[PDB]
Design a protein around this ligand. Structure first.
Ligand SMILES: Cn1nc([C@H]2CCC(=O)NC2=O)c2ccc(NC3CCNCC3)cc21
Ligand SMILES: [Zn+2]
Lengths: 808, 373
């Protein structure tokens, strides 16, 4: 009984995969980028990147590779999704038409098994003979590579090692050989196996087992003529080739942890390494020729190339040009110079690409005072933090760097400013204290202040988080004011409202007092600041026993959640908070939403409660509840009877209050009414719209995710819902998806333990794409359609779809 | 210096027993009807043992029929003893059986263990003096790690940790590295750790370690479900708390509730008095692998639960040492009664002559005890 509609306003931006090779032609250098569900294909040229193609897949891309079987002019792309749909695709271009041909496809799911903690792993034989996969612990799946395997049938092999840290293939071996590093009670080791397709089994590898560092994580398969493998851990780098064994411990690596790598020269004479803190190293392999025998290694070196964005994947294109794909910030295209600048870095920034994600909080405002709204979001983390202003013009985006992690944001019209909660990383000093790592917005405020309440009365090299409240102008986006909180304090909630008869507007902040020894908070604060004449004042404060997990302004009073308790304070004329109502529950009220006199309480375990406030008695009475063990990210209220939430496995669910029930038992239960598989990790919900203000849709809710995607959700009516469902069925029947994946399976509610078809949600992306097809396909889709009644020609469908698309 | 594996075997009821090997796991959420014992006022938790001596014709016939078909029956936790109603119960699988004759009366010795929970959906009275309840098997939900849903891979190579050394710094490092992706969400790291199975288990074990000082990591199970059931079995609370812990369907929620109960309870007192200091939390200490509380059966026929403690007040002792069917091999015992209510409370035990062991032992029954949180 939901009748909802969900569409995507901004496509995801975070890049999770990148590869390079000859894909579109035998002589063109191609770069392929995978951003969640989107695939982009560029042709590298002298000046930069020229976009060539862009497509979408009905799933999340977990593995991507390029390989050229014998007798192939170009390469083929092997792709695997998060639901274990696998496919092999080819690039076909005839004249002015570009499309990807599905050479093969299949599903490689297993009936039973617990997925490995380390996640999906996929590799390909350098000889292009088979594909190896690691999905569930204790098993290793193998897919033969033959022209007669259009169904992609694979078989499993047993691994006696349960916890396999990493695995890779090896070069220059007569039979397929795999080297992998695993762990057991004794420690971590590296072992090699030979894969026998004929017998479908394992055989003793070329060289025996060996012991490695206690933190080895990276395995690199050096090509010919060196052969062997390289193990990269926390404090050492080693090279194994059977009898030959070499090792080095570069001190300049102890600070960060290598997480990405890539190969520069074809013969494996150099490599690029990327750590967690936006650093880029160049690893070199020296070569020595002895007599008339295959060259051998002599030594290893690491040189600090420089600094870039926090890198998730690296790729060397040409002429010392490197693509750095990142998830916490903007992607980059940089250059390498033989010489060094004065500072000493060999990297020269060339080009940048925006990345909204991750989105941790947002608000909708109207800076121009028109009817057209604008969206302000807190994007990125660490030195990549910033504010993003999005306005409809394609979307127009403006970025304001901060150099620290923002967490919250709110708007206050009267003062014409934004209040932002933020945090920065500081390192303990020798004398005992804190020192910042770099200039940031928190430390560069025109005016500064430090909280001084005294209401409550370590080691070297440790890291701490310093929280701050930043008052930012709304025209120039410059940091007007900064206020620091007490040491060891945490900020959780932020609001701006007016209380009681007081005509002023305050910032009300909730904070918790956390200590490493204690496991749960036991003391927190609510602070009321007033920002006037460019200065911030601590108007009032109240100390509570617990941790304020949320706050919402409730018809002139303040509603707060303290541990497993809900409290309602009023605002007397003496500028103070006096507790007015209390209510005790059995869960922590992490999520708190309000609507008229109804309050929605939500817990991290997907427990939902619906309460009401009794004005005549001034007490809280429980109205409804619903409990179902699962992970929940956010909740929202659509109307007086419908509620929306984001659940584990990247799912959306919609519950309804059964007010039509006859007996109390039914009246006090919330019936689930809608399920959907969004494919994104929803992080924040908000009410508003980006288009300037009879319509076929009522209301609108925007949601922001972790990959930088932005989505919109609206309501509908029964007739429109049925019409759209029929249209979607017909379109799925007609159109074809890349990889030959069934759309319904893609939008099926997945939870790793149960699966159900999507209900109550009308996918909007398919309807929108309805317009990009040729006329004959539209006629085929519209054939035998009953629309208000008549034959329902394609013109009616086109008009209705245009009406829908107009909403964004 | 007293063996902790002796009382667990229940050697008192018998030495040689016809052990039955094999398991029959009922399909989840299915609907099945099973016989119910007539006289049972004990709430059974999965993974706990239960002996029983039976001498009634209809009950003995029921057991004889059952001992060959599946060896499974049902136990109903009664919310109210007077009115025999219940909404939740536990399936019990029998793993022992013996027969005896006492000059013309058949006596059956049975040992079983709980397997699964359920919500009763109907009950009927067969024309044999017993009852049969049709019920649906409840589900056992286990959730993946909270951080697995945040992203897909990110840094999966760092999600596996070195073996825990045989610790504060280790725990801090574990929290810092395991939940590193928490910065991509709207909640801090400690908030996520508050819903982590391993941290909850470690806190539970640390809380319990005061009671037993020789406790071994192998002494308590490793799986969250087994650990939760074991902890819930051996806590000194009234039947309402046990029913509440039974209703919970998720391991994490059960662990959180158990930790809350542990941190709330302070002391116990006579049920009839409602105000009589008999013992505090610290005094609790176990002498068996199962824990301070375990199941036993009087040769008279009634089965009484008892715990282990080393201090009692407001008690009057009555009787002299005896050893005829005592559950532990080698010990004296004398009845005790409330000083004010005069009601029987427990049994005072004196160690045996052999070598030496705790001379004064107090073993009470939860029926006459109630916490004072
Ligand atoms: C009432 N009551 N309680 C017990 C407890 C005491 C503590 C224990 O370790 N186990 C128990 O069984 C007990 C044991 C034996 C008899 N025996 C009588 C009936 C059979 N004929 C001989 C007299 C009665 C008994
Ligand atoms: Zn008493």
């Amino acid at each position: 009984m939901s009748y909802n509609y969900v569409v995507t306003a901004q496509k995801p931006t975070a890049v999770n995969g990148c590869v390079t090779g000859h894909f579109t032609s035998a002589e063109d250098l191609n770069l392929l980028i995978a951003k969640n569900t989107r695939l982009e294909i560029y042709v590298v040229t002298a000046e930069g990147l020229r976009p060539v193609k862009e497509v979408g897949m009905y799933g999340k891309i977990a593995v991507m590779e390029l390989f050229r079987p014998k007798g192939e002019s170009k390469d083929l792309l092997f792709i695997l999704t998060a639901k274990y749909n696998a496919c092999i695709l080819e690039y076909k271009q005839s004249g002015e038409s570009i499309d990807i041909i599905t050479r093969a496809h299949g599903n490689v799911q297993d009936r039973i098994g617990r997925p490995s903690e380390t996640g999906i792993i996929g590799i390909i034989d350098p000889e292009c003979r088979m594909i190896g996969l690691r999905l569930y612990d204790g098993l290793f799946k193998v897919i033969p590579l033959d022209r007669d395997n259009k169904e992609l049938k694979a078989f499993n092999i047993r691994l006696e090692e349960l916890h396999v840290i990493d695995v890779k293939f090896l070069y220059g071996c007569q039979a397929p050989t795999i080297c992998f590093v695993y762990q057991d009670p004794q420690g971590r080791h590296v072992k090699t196996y030979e894969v026998s397709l004929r017998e479908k089994e394992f055989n003793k590898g070329p060289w025996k087992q060996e012991n490695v560092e206690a933190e080895a994580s990276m395995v690199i398969a050096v090509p010919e003529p060196f052969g062997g493998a390289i193990i990269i851990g926390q404090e050492s780098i080693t090279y194994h080739n059977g009898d030959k064994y070499l090792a080095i411990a570069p001190p300049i690596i102890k600070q960060s942890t290598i997480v990405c790598h890539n190969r520069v020269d074809p013969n494996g004479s150099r490599y690029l390494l990327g750590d967690m803190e936006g650093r880029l190293f160049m690893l070199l392999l020296e070569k020595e020729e002895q007599m008339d025998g295959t060259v051998t290694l002599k030594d290893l070196r690491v040189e600090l190339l420089g600094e870039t964005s926090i890198a998730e994947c690296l790729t060397y294109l040409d002429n010392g040009v490197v693509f750095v794909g990142s998830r916490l910030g903007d992607s980059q295209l940089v250059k390498l110079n033989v010489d060094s600048n004065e500072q000493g870095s060999y990297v020269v920034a060339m080009e940048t690409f925006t990345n909204l994600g991750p989105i941790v909080d947002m608000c909708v405002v109207d800076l121009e005072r028109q009817g057209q709204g604008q969206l302000v979001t807190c994007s990125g983390a660490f030195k990549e933090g910033s504010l993003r202003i999005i306005r409809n013009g394609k979307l127009h985006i403006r970025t304001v760097p901060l150099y620290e992690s923002p967490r919250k944001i709110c708007y206050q019209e009267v003062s014409q400013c934004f209040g932002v909660l933020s945090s920065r990383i500081e390192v303990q000093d020798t004398s005992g204290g804190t020192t910042a790592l770099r200039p940031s917005a928190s430390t560069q405020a025109l005016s500064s202040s430090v909280s001084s309440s005294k209401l409550f009365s370590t080691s070297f090299g440790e890291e701490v988080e310093v929280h701050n409240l930043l008052i930012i102008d709304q025209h120039t986006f410059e940091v007007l004011h900064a206020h620091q909180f007490l040491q060891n304090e945490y900020a959780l909630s932020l609001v701006s409202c007016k209380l009681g008869k007081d005509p002023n507007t305050y910032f009300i902040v909730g904070t918790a007092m956390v200590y490493p020894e204690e496991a749960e908070p036991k003391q927190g604060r609510i602070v009321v600041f007033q920002y006037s004449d460019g200065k911030l004042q601590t108007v009032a404060e109240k100390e509570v026993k617990g941790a304020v997990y949320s706050m919402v302004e409730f018809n002139g009073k303040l509603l707060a959640s303290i541990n497993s308790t809900v409290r309602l304070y009023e605002w007397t004329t003496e500028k103070e908070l006096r507790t007015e109502c209390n209510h005790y529950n059995n869960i922590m009220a992490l999520y708190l939403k309000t609507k008229g006199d109804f309050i929605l309480v939500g817990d991290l375990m997907r427990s939902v409660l619906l309460l009401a406030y009794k004005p005549m008695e001034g007490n809280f009475e429980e109205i409804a509840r619903d409990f179902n063990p699962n992970w929940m990210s956010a909740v929202e209220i659509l109307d007086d009877d419908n509620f929306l939430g984001a659940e584990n496995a990247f799912n959306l669910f919609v519950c309804q209050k059964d007010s039509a029930a006859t007996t109390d038992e039914e009246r006090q239960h919330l019936q689930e009414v809608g399920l959907f598989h969004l494919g994104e990790f929803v992080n924040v919900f908000c009410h508003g719209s980006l288009v300037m203000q009879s319509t076929p849709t009522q209301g609108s809710v925007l949601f922001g995710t972790v990959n930088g995607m932005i989505g919109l959700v609206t309501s509908l009516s029964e007739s429109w819902y049925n019409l759209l469902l029929d249209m979607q069925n017909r379109l799925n029947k007609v159109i074809k998806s890349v990889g030959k994946i069934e759309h319904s399976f893609w939008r099926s509610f997945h939870t790793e333990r149960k699966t159900e078809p999507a209900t109550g949600f009308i996918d909007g992306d398919l309807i929108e794409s309805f317009l990009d097809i040729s006329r004959p396909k539209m006629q085929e889709v519209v054939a035998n359609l009953q629309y208000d009644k008549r034959e329902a020609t394609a013109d009616d469908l086109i008009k209705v779809v245009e009406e829908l698309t107009r909403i964004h | 210096n007293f063996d902790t594996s002796l009382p667990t075997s229940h050697t008192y009821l018998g030495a040689d027993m016809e052990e039955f090997h094999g398991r029959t796991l009922h399909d989840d959420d299915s609907c099945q009807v099973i016989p119910v014992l007539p006289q049972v006022m004990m709430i059974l938790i999965p993974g706990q043992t239960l002996p029983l001596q039976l001498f009634h014709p209809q009950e003995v016939s029921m057991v004889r029929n059952l001992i060959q078909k599946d060896r499974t029956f049902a136990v109903l936790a009664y919310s109210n003893v007077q009115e025999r109603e219940a909404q939740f119960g536990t399936t019990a699988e029998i793993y022992a059986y013996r027969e005896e004759q006492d000059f013309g009366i058949e006596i059956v010795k049975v040992k079983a263990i709980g397997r699964q929970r359920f919500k009763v959906l109907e009950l009927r009275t067969q024309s044999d003096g017993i009852q049969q309840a049709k019920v649906q098997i409840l589900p056992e939900c286990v959730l993946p790690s909270t951080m697995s849903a945040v992203q897909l891979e990110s840094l999966n190579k760092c999600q596996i940790f070195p073996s825990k050394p045989v610790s504060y710094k280790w725990w801090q490092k574990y929290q810092k590295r395991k939940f590193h992706c928490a910065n991509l969400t709207s909640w801090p790291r400690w908030l996520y750790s508050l819903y982590d199975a391993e941290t909850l288990m470690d806190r539970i074990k640390k809380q319990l370690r005061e009671w037993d000082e020789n406790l071994k990591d192998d002494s308590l199970p490793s799986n969250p479900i087994d650990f939760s059931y074991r902890v819930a079995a051996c806590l000194p609370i009234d039947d309402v708390l046990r029913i509440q812990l039974l209703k919970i369907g998720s391991a994490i929620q059960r662990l959180r509730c158990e930790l809350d109960i542990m941190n709330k309870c302070t002391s116990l007192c006579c049920k009839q008095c409602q105000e009589t200091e008999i013992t505090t939390k610290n005094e609790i200490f176990s002498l068996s692998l199962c824990g301070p509380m375990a199941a036993y059966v009087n040769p008279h026929g009634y089965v009484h639960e008892t715990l282990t403690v080393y201090k009692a007040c407001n008690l009057n002792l009555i009787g002299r040492p005896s050893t005829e069917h005592s559950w532990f091999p080698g010990y004296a015992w004398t009845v005790a009664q409330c000083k004010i209510c005069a009601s029987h409370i427990g049994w005072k035990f004196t160690a045996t002559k052999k070598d030496m062991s705790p001379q004064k032992f107090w073993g009470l029954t939860r029926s006459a005890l109630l916490p004072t949180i």
